[PDB]
């Protein structure tokens, strides 16, 4: 009957992969605070009792990695062995070297900033959809908000049995509308969250429905047929890195569009602007959102790609799902006349030397807080 | 004029992320050889001189991790300090614990195999396209074949300056055809490959065009306008983990569809069949390829999703790009009548206790070697 289901997930600040993303971006921010031109490629790994930093940094900054890592873990909420992880007493191991000189010479040494080469080859996508004001899929927006609500109720003490590691998943029934999509109802919600040894399962399931789901999801989307999977494993006392190893860049779909649109594969966290995996994906989001908010499309996917050492993108592509009166070729021409997607120009347009990256590393990089890539460009055409 | 560009990338066996995927799957295979029911979640991290294994394994097998890791690195070709990495002398560190008992009790303990719960929540996609016989995008097929050719010419000694770490990227111009896509020509090729200190840049660029590209890419796709970026960084002597940290699950788009279709975010390597990130993505590929090879569609995207501890998928969705006379609802009904996407049934249909996983961990998991998920199911409708 013209309807379909679509599912997206999100994870909380204490999910072990997301811990790693936040630490990687805390390290990036610490460098950028002192050296705006720091070259940073910081991967983090987390397992029981351990944060390991591994990668490549060339920077004039003097960074105390023990302090930066432990402060990030403190903020997430892992502050006691009873919770499975403690910033005060965990192991922090560092395996960081300089950036390869072969990369440096091929990318940025003795190059004018605007003409810096891409820091790697790769492909990146941006996406926007008019189904929400923030131009994001409803599935992923709701999933993120459910994790944020859990963290809020943990931190305000009203659900003191909550721990930081959580996952959520939202399935929405949609109608198709000339290539655009229209949310109808929420079909299924999953919530799994780490908890203390004392609270019982029925108390948790009742609280997750009444204090989390109902606080977040408009009642108009929930009905007698909605399916709830709340603490479906039955027990989640062991959690965080103790329950599951974490790595940076293992939540790339949570970080972006929740399965909608597409992904080029590259992780965001721990990387400075010369790594186009991040900067060009942010720019592609900016393009996509500019096209939708500018009234040219209702829904759009943008691809860009690069070669290491080369400034201009190798390819740019626009896919509008049939949601514009203009052809995709016409939209591509508008994009090319209004945007300069060299990394050394993106950095200026999106202010990408500013140390705001830890703020991006939970709850998605897009659709929130009026970051520069979320402020549409006025298009001339 | 109805044409568009699309870009995909691939990486070689010695790319540091791919090293980690191959080691993770070597560990999985080693366990499965002795214990077909091993529960494995093995992440690998690589940096200069180091392989670290971190994660969770519960298994009756007795596995010599030092031997398994070093044999995998040997096969890749890192056998001397002059190449940046040596299986004989690198550090192998192990941070492996049992699977969380809370996960085990919620997923598989005291469950009938067919009724085992999904090992996690999540979403997964399968994709197929009739543009090649193997039902894969031409962009990604060509990119993989370029890396395979590099490894072949390295191993046969005809380009003895080659080292194992490589990346390739292919941009194809396509025409749209009633929702299907038709490749026209290759617009741009990138190849970057690690090399010895003695070979010069012009020799490498000439060999990459004449002995690699021309050996792989049909001449009909290459013309006077094709752009070549061969060793675009100018120097790539430092490579492998020394040049760039590697982690398991950081090449998920290379592993799948090269930007085409969609991805749910979950990595494949190092995981047994109860981790639906892998098994349900393989099953979704199997569904998609069955629909295309069965003549029901020319191009199709399949989504499935799960909740931890629950056997049946929470959602199934079919998107045919307009390439079927049947509606998406009709195709979904055909899928539901022909496939059982419980993980404890997928394991039987796709033989997922068999230790063949290291073979999947380079050159893409799909479109090759007639693995069970590549053999179409005959559909009844
Ligand atoms: C199943 S392991 C993958 C993720 O699922 C979550 N998880 C861990 N243990 C459990 C559990 N017992 N029940 C439900 N989810 C869990 C954690 O966020 C982990 O990172
Ligand atoms: C740029 S670092 C990311 C990837 O690019 C490759 N790479 C590393 N060094 C170089 C180099 N000097 N030139 C081109 N590619 C490189 C390696 O495959 C690495 O994993
Ligand atoms: K893991
Ligand atoms: K890296
Ligand atoms: Mg993970
Ligand atoms: Mg990358
Ligand atoms: Mg990588
Ligand atoms: Mg996963």
UniProtKB/Swiss-Prot annotation, chains A, B:
<keyword id="KW-0554">One-carbon metabolism</keyword>
<feature type="binding site" description="in other chain">
    <location>
        <position position="244"/>
    </location>
    <ligand>
        <name>ATP</name>
    </ligand>
</feature>
<dbReference type="InterPro" id="IPR022636">
    <property type="entry name" value="S-AdoMet_synthetase_sfam"/>
</dbReference>
<dbReference type="GO" id="GO:1904263">
    <property type="term" value="P:positive regulation of TORC1 signaling"/>
</dbReference>
<feature type="binding site">
    <location>
        <position position="267"/>
    </location>
    <ligand>
        <name>ATP</name>
    </ligand>
</feature>
<dbReference type="InterPro" id="IPR022629">
    <property type="entry name" value="S-AdoMet_synt_central"/>
</dbReference>
<protein>
    <recommendedName>
        <fullName>S-adenosylmethionine synthase isoform type-2</fullName>
        <ecNumber>2.5.1.6</ecNumber>
    </recommendedName>
</protein>
<dbReference type="GO" id="GO:1990830">
    <property type="term" value="P:cellular response to leukemia inhibitory factor"/>
</dbReference>
<dbReference type="GO" id="GO:0004478">
    <property type="term" value="F:methionine adenosyltransferase activity"/>
</dbReference>
<feature type="binding site">
    <location>
        <position position="277"/>
    </location>
    <ligand>
        <name>ATP</name>
    </ligand>
</feature>
<dbReference type="InterPro" id="IPR022628">
    <property type="entry name" value="S-AdoMet_synt_N"/>
</dbReference>
<keyword id="KW-0547">Nucleotide-binding</keyword>
<dbReference type="GO" id="GO:0051291">
    <property type="term" value="P:protein heterooligomerization"/>
</dbReference>
<comment type="pathway">
    <text>Amino-acid biosynthesis; S-adenosyl-L-methionine biosynthesis; S-adenosyl-L-methionine from L-methionine: step 1/1.</text>
</comment>
<dbReference type="Pfam" id="PF02772">
    <property type="entry name" value="S-AdoMet_synt_M"/>
</dbReference>
<feature type="binding site">
    <location>
        <position position="271"/>
    </location>
    <ligand>
        <name>ATP</name>
    </ligand>
</feature>
<keyword id="KW-0832">Ubl conjugation</keyword>
<dbReference type="GO" id="GO:0048269">
    <property type="term" value="C:methionine adenosyltransferase complex"/>
</dbReference>
<dbReference type="InterPro" id="IPR022631">
    <property type="entry name" value="ADOMET_SYNTHASE_CS"/>
</dbReference>
<keyword id="KW-0630">Potassium</keyword>
<keyword id="KW-0479">Metal-binding</keyword>
<dbReference type="Pfam" id="PF00438">
    <property type="entry name" value="S-AdoMet_synt_N"/>
</dbReference>
<dbReference type="GO" id="GO:0005829">
    <property type="term" value="C:cytosol"/>
</dbReference>
<comment type="similarity">
    <text>Belongs to the AdoMet synthase family.</text>
</comment>
<dbReference type="GO" id="GO:0036094">
    <property type="term" value="F:small molecule binding"/>
</dbReference>
<keyword id="KW-0007">Acetylation</keyword>
<keyword id="KW-0808">Transferase</keyword>
<feature type="binding site" description="in other chain">
    <location>
        <position position="56"/>
    </location>
    <ligand>
        <name>L-methionine</name>
    </ligand>
</feature>
<feature type="binding site" description="in other chain">
    <location>
        <begin position="233"/>
        <end position="236"/>
    </location>
    <ligand>
        <name>ATP</name>
    </ligand>
</feature>
<keyword id="KW-0597">Phosphoprotein</keyword>
<dbReference type="GO" id="GO:0042802">
    <property type="term" value="F:identical protein binding"/>
</dbReference>
<feature type="binding site" description="in other chain">
    <location>
        <position position="99"/>
    </location>
    <ligand>
        <name>L-methionine</name>
    </ligand>
</feature>
<feature type="modified residue" description="Phosphoserine">
    <location>
        <position position="100"/>
    </location>
</feature>
<dbReference type="GO" id="GO:0034214">
    <property type="term" value="P:protein hexamerization"/>
</dbReference>
<feature type="binding site" description="in other chain">
    <location>
        <position position="15"/>
    </location>
    <ligand>
        <name>ATP</name>
    </ligand>
</feature>
<dbReference type="InterPro" id="IPR002133">
    <property type="entry name" value="S-AdoMet_synthetase"/>
</dbReference>
<feature type="binding site">
    <location>
        <position position="43"/>
    </location>
    <ligand>
        <name>K(+)</name>
    </ligand>
</feature>
<comment type="function">
    <text>Catalyzes the formation of S-adenosylmethionine from methionine and ATP. The reaction comprises two steps that are both catalyzed by the same enzyme: formation of S-adenosylmethionine (AdoMet) and triphosphate, and subsequent hydrolysis of the triphosphate.</text>
</comment>
<dbReference type="InterPro" id="IPR022630">
    <property type="entry name" value="S-AdoMet_synt_C"/>
</dbReference>
<dbReference type="GO" id="GO:0006730">
    <property type="term" value="P:one-carbon metabolic process"/>
</dbReference>
<feature type="modified residue" description="N6-acetyllysine">
    <location>
        <position position="67"/>
    </location>
</feature>
<keyword id="KW-1017">Isopeptide bond</keyword>
């Amino acid at each position: 009957e013209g309807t379909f289901l679509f599912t997206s997930e999100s994870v909380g600040e204490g999910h072990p992969d997301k811990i790693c993303d936040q630490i990687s971006d805390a390290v990036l921010d610490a460098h950028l605070q002192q050296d705006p031109d720091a070259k940073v490629a910081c991967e983090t790994v987390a397992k029981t009792g351990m944060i390991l930093l591994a990668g490549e940094i060339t920077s004039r900054a003097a960074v105390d990695y023990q302090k930066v890592v432990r402060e990030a873990v403190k903020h997430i909420g892992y502050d006691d062995s009873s919770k499975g992880f403690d910033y005060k007493t965990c192991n922090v191991l560092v395996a960081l070297e300089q950036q390869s000189p072969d990369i440096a010479q091929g990318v940025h040494l003795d190059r004018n900033e605007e003409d810096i080469g891409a820091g790697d080859q790769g492909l990146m996508f941006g996406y926007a959809t008019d189904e929400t004001e923030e131009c994001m899929p409803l599935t992923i927006v709701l999933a993120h908000k459910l994790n944020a609500k859990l963290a809020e109720l943990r931190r305000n003490g009203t659900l003191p049995w909550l721990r930081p590691d959580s996952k959520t998943q939202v399935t929405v029934q949609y109608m198709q509308d000339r290539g655009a999509v229209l949310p109808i109802r929420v079909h299924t919600i999953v919530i799994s969250v780490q908890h203390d040894e004392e609270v019982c399962l029925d108390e948790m399931r009742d609280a997750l429905k009444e204090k989390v789901i109902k606080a977040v999801v408009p009642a108009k989307y929930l009905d007698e047929d909605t399916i709830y999977h709340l603490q479906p494993s039955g027990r989640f006392v062991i959690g965080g890195p103790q329950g599951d190893a974490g790595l940076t860049g293992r939540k790339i779909i949570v970080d972006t569009y929740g399965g909608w649109g597409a992904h080029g594969g590259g992780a965001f966290s721990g990387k400075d602007y010369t790594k186009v995996d991040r900067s060009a994906a942010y720019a592609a989001r900016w393009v996509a959102k500019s096209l939708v908010k500018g009234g040219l499309c209702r829904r759009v996917l943008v691809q860009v790609s690069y070669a290491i050492g080369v400034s201009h993108p190798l390819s740019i592509s626009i896919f509008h799902y049939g949601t514009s009166q203009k052809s995709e070729r016409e939209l591509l021409e508008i994009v090319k006349k209004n945007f300069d997607l060299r990394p050394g120009v993106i950095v200026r347009d999106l202010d990408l030397k500013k140390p705001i990256y830890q703020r991006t590393a939970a709850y998605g990089h897009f659709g929130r807080d009026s970051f520069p890539w979320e402020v549409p460009k006025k298009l001339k055409y």
